[PDB]
Amino acid sequence: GPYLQILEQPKQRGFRFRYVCEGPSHGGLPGASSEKNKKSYPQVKICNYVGPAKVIVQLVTNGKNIHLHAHSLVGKHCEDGVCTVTAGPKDMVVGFANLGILHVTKKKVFETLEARMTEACIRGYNPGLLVHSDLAYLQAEGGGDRQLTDREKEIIRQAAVQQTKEMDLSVVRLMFTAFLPDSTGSFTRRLEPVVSDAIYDSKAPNASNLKIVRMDRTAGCVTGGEEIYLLCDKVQKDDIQIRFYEEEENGGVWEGFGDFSPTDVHRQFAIVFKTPKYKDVNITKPASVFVQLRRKSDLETSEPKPFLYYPE
Amino acid sequence: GPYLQILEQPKQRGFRFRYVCEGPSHGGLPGASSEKNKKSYPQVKICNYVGPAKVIVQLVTNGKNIHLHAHSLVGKHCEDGVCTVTAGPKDMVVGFANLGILHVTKKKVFETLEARMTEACIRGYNPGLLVHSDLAYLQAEGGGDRQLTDREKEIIRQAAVQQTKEMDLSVVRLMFTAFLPDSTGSFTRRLEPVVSDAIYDSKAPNASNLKIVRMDRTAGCVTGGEEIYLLCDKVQKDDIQIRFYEEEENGGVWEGFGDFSPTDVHRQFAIVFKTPKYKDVNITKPASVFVQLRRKSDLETSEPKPFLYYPE
DNA sequence: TCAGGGGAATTCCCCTC
DNA sequence: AGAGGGGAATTCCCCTG
């Protein structure tokens, strides 16, 4: 039967979540292949069905238990945190550009979560899957307006109080839900929604972009233990590593880490370290290796920089 | 007649202002001559008068107009921002230890300021000097009993709205006011108040501590621009200078600033720059020069570190 | 501009005596 | 095991191109 397939996922890292105070129009959530000039965006595709339909996007949690996220989606076609756009009549592919991720305050988690749960219940956008199964009977029953009862508000507040202590404000996910038309033509037939890759805030120190801005000495001796200063982006002294590596044997790898202490990490932006020992200390020609910044917890690679080992 | 003399002023820089959230036990305001083990505190002395008296201390602003400051003084003898202590019979020496400077939020400045202005009018603590000259008639009538009128509250609120946007939250001053007894014995005869030195918050980037944490090359050549990386504390790229200096017996004033661009200042904590040319390029012996970080606005001295120029 | 980025203000938490 | 600081994370502000 018909389903929804994510053609291009959003970029997991590099995007910066912004609060209401930071202002508007600061960038759109880019695609996984959104290099400079080759600006791409998250794309989905409704398969096994040809014709006009609608696609909604909502923010969900990163944990095993999928639930609504207090963060919102801001931009055009987005109202109250949900972005709704009509798919092409023939191009069953849908792209999402100019999507910002509104970061909520920790104190304003409960308030925003409850408000957007109320919205998701009045609009019937997967009420039982994200809030609570007790309200999984509101699959757009009726046309348009769907006033809520008193017990339904009770369930909303119960789900909100329980999901406040379990929400990571630094990571979100995209849930794409497709809606196929019915008899009257209104988009109401809901197929299985699909969750996107995890989206990590750039303001989170454990998931930012690892970049080697500058190095004082770009070429050391094959012996090693030479002091080098590396100016970098924001890194955590207890969760940072400087890795020299070279591809060898056409398949094999050579690693080697700089010997530095967390005290040598100067205020998250600079590291004074010492070069490790190379393989062939009895080398004859200067060998070329790459250097990167690797997070010990995430094992995330920084963009490598050239480095050279010279004999003595 | 009798006056009040500040024996030891507080240390102008080095102390960090703290908000209500940061807690209570983060340090006491040290004196200008304080050091480790030699723990000193701001002290004053009532001169030309022997006997019991009273000394109050209040926070005032730095600027042309001396006025109450939204920041408060926290501690034992301090209540609602004013620290009152009896000089004791025949002691006449007054010390002020365990004094913290409560940093208020920008949003809650006005609320606090007006709240402390009314108090200064109800208690008669220099109302015309600190609040507004129109209220320079509020002395000695009552120490709490004298409720204020409506026009007085209008003047207080006007002074508060005008001085909220005119207050520097990063610098304060201490005002000591002495009170001699009268016939009935109540301390009400006000002596001339004395203002202390300016106290600059260490967490303010324009008044922080200038420290040379690390240098890539600690000895360069007299030839000229050699690139060296300097790891430092928080400095402002548009208001920072790297000064090479040497005191000599022939006038002994040689200045010379490192050739760096504000772009070379890596995230306020590192500067990649080039050493300037010293005098006597045709030297024969290695000459020693010292290095500092000098703030462009304040011309404040950093802790010097050794450096040397060798010929070619 | 809209797309970013740096940095300041504010809150929270850890390291060394 | 706690005060004194200091660093780091979380929100907020606004400058640049």
Based on the number of CB atoms within 10 Å of its own CB, is B305 exposed (0-12), middle (13-18) or buried (19 or more)? middle
Asked whether B231 and B213 are in contact (CB, 8 A), the reply is: yes
Residue B266 and residue A266: Cβ atoms within 8 Å? no
The resolution of the experimental structure, rounded to one decimal in Å, is: 3.0
Chain C bases under 7 Å from protein CB? 1-13
CA distance A273 to A262: 10
Write the residue in A213, A234, A266 that is nearest to B213 by C-beta: A266
**Residues of chain B contacting residue A229, judged by C-beta atoms under 8 Å apart:** 214, 216, 229, 231
**b/e per residue A46-83 (b: at least 16 CB within 10 A):** beebeeebbbbbbbbbbeeebbbbbbbbbbebbeebbb
**Is the domain of B88 the same as that of B139?**
yes
Instruction: Choose one of A157, A186, A203: the last residue of a domain.
Output: A203
Nearest nucleotide to B109, CA against C1' atoms: C9
User: For tokens 């002294």, what's the residue?
Assistant: A237
**Residues of chain A contacting residue B227, judged by C-beta atoms under 8 Å apart:** 216
Write the residue in A214, A233, A266 that is nearest to B272 by C-beta: A214
Nearest nucleotide to A75, CA against C1' atoms: C2
SS3 B17: coil
Total residues belonging to chain A: 312
Secondary structure (DSSP) of chain A? --EEEEEEPBPSSS---B-STT-S-S----BTT--SSS----EEEEES--S--EEEEEEE-SSSS--B-SSEEESTTEETTEEEEEPPSS--EEE--S-EEEPPPSTTHHHHHHHHHHHHHHHTSSHHHHT-GGGTT-SS-SSS-----HHHHHHHHHHHHHHHTT--TTEEEEEEEEEEE-SSS-EEEE---EE---EE-TTSTTSS---EEEES-SEEESS---EEEEEESS--GGG-EEEEEEEETTTEEEEEE----GGGEETTTEEEEE----S-SS-SS-EEEEEEEE-TTT-PPPPPEEEEEE--
Interface residue A277 vs chain B (CB under 8 A):
no
Q: Taking Cα atoms as reference points, which of A198, A182, A174, A230 lies closest to residue A52?
A: A182
Asked whether A25 and A34 are in contact (CB, 8 A), the reply is: no
| C-alpha pair distances (Å), A16 with each of A49, A101, A107, A235 | 35, 8, 20, 16
How many CB atoms within 10 Å of residue B157? 15
φ, ψ for residue B16, nearest 5 deg: -105, 125
Which residues does strand D reach (CB under 7 angstroms)? A 19-23, 103, 105-107, 169-170, 203-206, 234, 236-237, 265, 267-268; B 14, 16, 22, 25-28, 30, 98, 202, 233
Nearest nucleotide to B100, CA against C1' atoms: D4
**What is the β-pairing status of strands A3-8 and A43-47?**
antiparallel
Residue B21 CA distance to nucleotide C10 C1' (Å): 9
- Looking at chain B, which runs of residues are DSSP E strands? 3-8, 43-47, 54-60, 72-74, 78-79, 82-86, 93-95, 100-102, 171-181, 187-190, 194-195, 199-200, 212-215, 220-221, 227-232, 240-245, 265-266, 270-274, 287-295, 305-310
SS3 B237: helix
Instruction: Choose one of A175, A203, A231: the last residue of a domain.
Output: A203
Residue B84 CA distance to nucleotide C9 C1' (Å): 31
CA distance A208 to A223: 33
Whether the beta carbon of B268 falls within 7 A of nucleic chain C: the reply is: yes
Residue B269 and residue A269: Cβ atoms within 8 Å? yes
SS3 B121: helix
Residue A272 and residue B227: Cβ atoms within 8 Å? no
| Tokens standing for residue B120 | 């200064």
Partnered with residue B72 across adjacent β-strands are: B102
**Is the domain of A193 the same as that of A240?**
no
Asked whether B136 and B19 are in contact (CB, 8 A), the reply is: no
Whether the beta carbon of B103 falls within 7 A of nucleic chain C: the reply is: yes
Asked whether B45 and B71 are in contact (CB, 8 A), the reply is: no
Q: What is the CA radius of gyration of chain B?
A: 25
Cα angle for residues B74, B76, B78 (degrees, 5° grid) = 50
Nearest chain A Cα distance for residue B218, angstroms = 13
User: For tokens 């000229």, what's the residue?
Assistant: B224
Nearest nucleotide to B211, CA against C1' atoms: D6
Instruction: Choose one of A162, A183, A203: the last residue of a domain.
Output: A203
3-state secondary structure B22-85: CCCCCCCCCECCCCCCCCCCCEEEEECCCCCCEEEEEEECCCCCCCECCCEEECCCEECCEEEE
DSSP letter (8 states) at residue B160: H
Asked whether A59 and A170 are in contact (CB, 8 A), the reply is: no
Q: Which domain holds residue A35?
A: 1-203
| C-alpha pair distances (Å), A113 with each of A125, A170, A201, A216, B158 | 15, 15, 19, 48, 41
**Is the domain of A243 the same as that of A267?**
yes
SS3 B182: coil
| Tokens standing for residue B186 | 């109540």
Asked whether B58 and B177 are in contact (CB, 8 A), the reply is: yes
CATH code of the domain covering residue A11: 2.60.40.340
Based on the number of CB atoms within 10 Å of its own CB, is B166 exposed (0-12), middle (13-18) or buried (19 or more)? exposed
Residue B18 CA distance to nucleotide D3 C1' (Å): 15
| C-alpha pair distances (Å), A115 with each of A130, A135, A158 | 13, 16, 13
Write the residue in B227, B234, B270 that is nearest to A270 by C-beta: B270
- A interface test, pick of B106, B209, B214 with most A CB neighbours within 10 Å: B214
Residue B270 CA distance to nucleotide D15 C1' (Å): 21
User: For tokens 């490790």, what's the residue?
Assistant: A276
Within residues 7-26 of protein chain B, the ones with CB less than 7 A from nucleic strand C are 19-23
**Is the domain of B55 the same as that of B171?**
yes
**Is the domain of B120 the same as that of B88?**
yes
Which residues, numbered 193 to 222 in chain B, qualify as contacts with chain A under a Cβ-Cβ cut-off of 8 Å? 213-214, 216
**Is the domain of B17 the same as that of B114?**
yes
**Is the domain of A279 the same as that of A162?**
no
**Is the domain of A173 the same as that of A247?**
no
CA distance B26 to B86: 26
Q: Taking Cα atoms as reference points, which of B270, B108, B297 lies closest to residue B208?
A: B297
Beta-carbon contacts of residue A217 (< 8 Å; ≥ 6 apart): A226, A228, A229
The domain tally of chain A equals 2
Nearest nucleotide to B22, CA against C1' atoms: C11
**Is the domain of B196 the same as that of B287?**
no
Asked whether B176 and B193 are in contact (CB, 8 A), the reply is: yes
**b/e per residue B240-267 (b: at least 16 CB within 10 A):** bbbbbbbeeeeeeeeebebebeeebbbb
How big is the A-B interface in CB pairs under 8 Å?
A: 36
CA distance B237 to A53: 53
**Residues of chain A contacting residue B219, judged by C-beta atoms under 8 Å apart:** none
Based on the number of CB atoms within 10 Å of its own CB, is B77 exposed (0-12), middle (13-18) or buried (19 or more)? middle
**Is the domain of A271 the same as that of A172?**
no
**Is the domain of A221 the same as that of A312?**
yes
SS3 B249: coil
Q: What is the CA radius of gyration of chain A?
A: 25
Asked whether B231 and B269 are in contact (CB, 8 A), the reply is: yes
CATH code of the domain covering residue B247: 2.60.40.10
How many CB atoms within 10 Å of residue B103? 21
**Is the domain of A32 the same as that of A113?**
yes
